[model samples]
Target chain A: GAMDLYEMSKALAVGRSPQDIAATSEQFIASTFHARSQVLLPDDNGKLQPLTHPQGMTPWDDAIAQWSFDKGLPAGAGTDTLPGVPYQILPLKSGEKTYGLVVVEPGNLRQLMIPEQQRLLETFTLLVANALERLTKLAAAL
Target chain B: GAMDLYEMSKALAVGRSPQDIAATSEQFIASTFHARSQVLLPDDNGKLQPLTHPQGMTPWDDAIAQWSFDKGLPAGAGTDTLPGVPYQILPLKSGEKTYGLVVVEPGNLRQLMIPEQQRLLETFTLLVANALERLTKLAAAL
Candidate 1:
């Protein structure tokens, strides 16, 4: 489906609640990559947990993802951390502080990712990250 | 050159001043599209003026860009607002408030834009728009 990121962000900015953000983030990333995905955020105990339901979902390299999140950087695939892994991990961070992570599940189209599309994926992660950050800041904005 | 949107935004959030924001916005968009671009924001009198230097710049339909700015919507090429004239106007707005405009010059790869790429472009505009908005609010936040 040809989804408009603009409209998605608009509705997201309109106060979609926590679940809505989690659900929408997962769906949009999956749609953009033509693969299944998951949104992992730090729990109250500071442990990474899946925000999206993972039914029928294939497992990703959690070690790499955790490393990415802990280090506040991307890992897997083209990234240096656990490059042997097929999937990828993109940490959702505002500067050095990471709030969450997006893990793209490996799929048939995994090998099809060129440098441009990979960069596009990076920006998409930034999109949701920024939206999430704004939701938090706007919650208490003057 | 594969520029990182994440890094550009991190620096953007680091208080690079007004001119830096405008310059970075123009350069990044131009890099992403591989086409010359101009960032136009309203002057003190609310008249749209170029934020970037237009040295040796080819003319885009400023009329359509103005219409797009007035409407707080995208215009030109594939859009209803003077599509025949070519070029494209993307309003740098947060929700409905228009802060500026990004005019993408027509280029060789302009014909290569698929639906996915168009969606990507929209998000990139949103990136800078949101950045600009955040810069203002963060300043006023104090």
Candidate 2:
């Protein structure tokens, strides 16, 4: 949590040609979590699939979305009880419109989240949104 | 972990903004035991911290440049045997000249960062970079 947005800002100042910024971001999370597999699917629905997953992959989709919109940036996690696939969801967004999500699947899925955890996720989401907005600008410029 | 990203994207395309990507990333890490908190001092002179912090925080005075320089290419988690915080010492170049690091976080406090975790972080970093670049362009346009 509390990751810096300065790195993202620097990437925007220059061209989108470099991939370091994104790489750095992912690495930061990697160091934090021990994930089995981490993947990013832009413009695709955030559903875990066997490959082209159908709708209603997870049960808490609605809950996560509601929390995200209502809380303005919400996160939820569950394991064993929900489809036996330990999972957590964080809403990726910018101002009023959501962008893409950043997800990770660690070994232990179900755990209580403290206030600090919530705060950290909130800050990280802001950074991601800012970064997305940064890239959007670059893409538009090009 | 995988479901939320799509949820955000769907929400965003339909005008939903997320609260935090950084937080989500943390949740992903917490889901697994791979990550642990770490702290970074200004200068350790090649000495690891006495204790690891649960909240990943680091301080790099000046050697940050040299630190990156040593990381070399293919920088990411699990790419090689590299462990700890997934970092890179990218050489910045604009047009033709070398331009110091536009963004550099020398020491990253992370968990175990196994091979799978490393790959995940790499992907995450790439996405963050794109998002950052896009936002930068948007700002420049304004």
Candidate 3:
């Protein structure tokens, strides 16, 4: 997989560029899901955009992405406010702070994963949140 | 509900004691799995000890726990070096570093949960790893 958790953590810890960190995380998730995944991060203007291109993600309804970002809640599938969507949308947040959103096409995955899959998906986002937060803190230290 | 990722992250974010952080994480994992769970943190001698008592954990083979700590690999069930145990054991880790170990009894839950459940479980441990890591980094910042 990623070899070891320490290696994966170090990949984030060793003061890499934020883009590198995000790209590394996207690779981890995409490989695990065996599906193309997308990481959405807010720009300086606080609008979410894909961190990388063509990583198994198709065009998303930015409306749902922004809604999850603004409300800080997951939208799509069970959390859906807007239905009939192609992606399972979620917010990548870390405690009182909204980092961004993540979209899993779930095209190969079942429509509306079972509760177990849902928890797995949420946990993956949590990892992305920490990776980003760690990037910022490491910078602040310098 | 844990309210949101914000609340759960805050559960570990705001400076409570380390005990509080560990306890909150166990609660989250236990509730999600609907089974008893345990958190094993290494002691002064680098020996692992339970973070809280009377969690869904039964007595684990001390040998197995020690093996996971030292080797940084999971033992028990599929990853078992010692087989026929009642628990699924895993190291609580971030990218490259090993934090501690966790045991889920999985009583009432299916034995050797489907590939899907396994991923969900792994994702949950990743959450614990960050919660503790967050605690330490917060202290270092202070």
Candidate 4:
């Protein structure tokens, strides 16, 4: 049970392409956080959009579109930018390079406010960042 | 600081290939658990070998070589199979399929015996199992 994190992280990287990493990361976040999460990636037009929903037409989609790289938002809900949505955001980054951002809406509001809960969310996002960083680099190399 | 675990798990899944996953998992376990950990994968000969060390020739190597999947062993450090060594084991699985095992030796003696610590280990491994299952299937598809 406790050891699964180690295994999941190892298994996530076991693939031929970056998409494998992205898909695994999204699934892991959704299951663990018990929330609806999305991985926003740049489209052919070099604009950010949810990988699953490319149109960027919905309110949720539009919000992510306005999230800028320079903002440096802390991890948690209650952000002024996306008011009324209990969004938990983690920028997928490695040093100066940014792959994307993982945004999740916490299923339980009470738990999300707890410090430990926020910590857990942050840690999970870090894992997402690390995976994205590595996979992005791998994708670049090929 | 507390955000490390979540971030770590997320990042672990973002990478190039299976080998990267294995390496990152080993590093994450070693640093977070403060333990010496290794990821084992079944070789072409149907034997388990540390992904890091395919040639199992040392005492540490021999013990893992003898690990039996049939024992249905619980997660803990003090198994009779390897007396005096606190071995924490997690079998990588997704439903019916089993990928491999993650073994760790905790740095501290007392913390290894705690229930919460054990729970953390179990959850971590579940993440590992989830990642491995996805990546393995992805690899198969590719």
lDDT of each: 0.69, 0.38, 0.68, 0.58
Q: In angstroms, how far off is B136's CA in candidate 1?
A: 4.1
Error of 2 at A104 (Å): 2.1
How well does candidate 1 match the true structure, expressed as C-alpha RMSD? Answer: 4.7
Residue by residue across A1-142, what tens digits does model 2's lDDT show?
2223334334434434224434544554434443332223243343322223224233335444444444444354532223344555555565565444544445544432445444444445555555555565455565
Give the TM-score (vs. native) of candidate 2: 0.36
Error of 2 at B142 (Å): 7.1
Fraction of native contacts, model 1: 0.18
lDDT of 3 by residue, A18-123 (tens): 6876676666666666556677888778888754447445667787688888888877656547556566777777776777777777655573376755665565
DockQ per model, Cα: 0.28, 0.10, 0.31, 0.09
Q: lDDT per residue, candidate 1, A1-142, as tens digits?
A: 2444655566555544556676788877776677777888776676688634477665676666677878888876777677776577788876667878887774654542677677767766776777667655555574
TM-score of chain A of 1: 0.80
Give candidate 4 regions above 4 Å deviation: A1-61, A64-76, A83-111, A121-142, B14-17, B51-85
Stronger candidate by DockQ (2 vs 3): 3
lDDT of 4 by residue, A35-59 (tens): 6667776555656665454232223
- State each model's C-alpha RMSD to the native: 4.7, 14.0, 5.4, 6.9
Q: How does model 2 score on DockQ?
A: 0.10
Q: TM-score per candidate, in order?
A: 0.69, 0.36, 0.66, 0.55
Instruction: Report the C-alpha lDDT of model 4 over B1-142, residue by residue, as the tens digit.
Output: 2444555565555655667767877777777777777777666665677534333222354444335432334344555555555566666654445566777776675776578766666556655655565465556545
Ranking of candidates on DockQ, top first: 3, 1, 2, 4
iRMS, all models: 2.7, 9.0, 3.3, 8.5
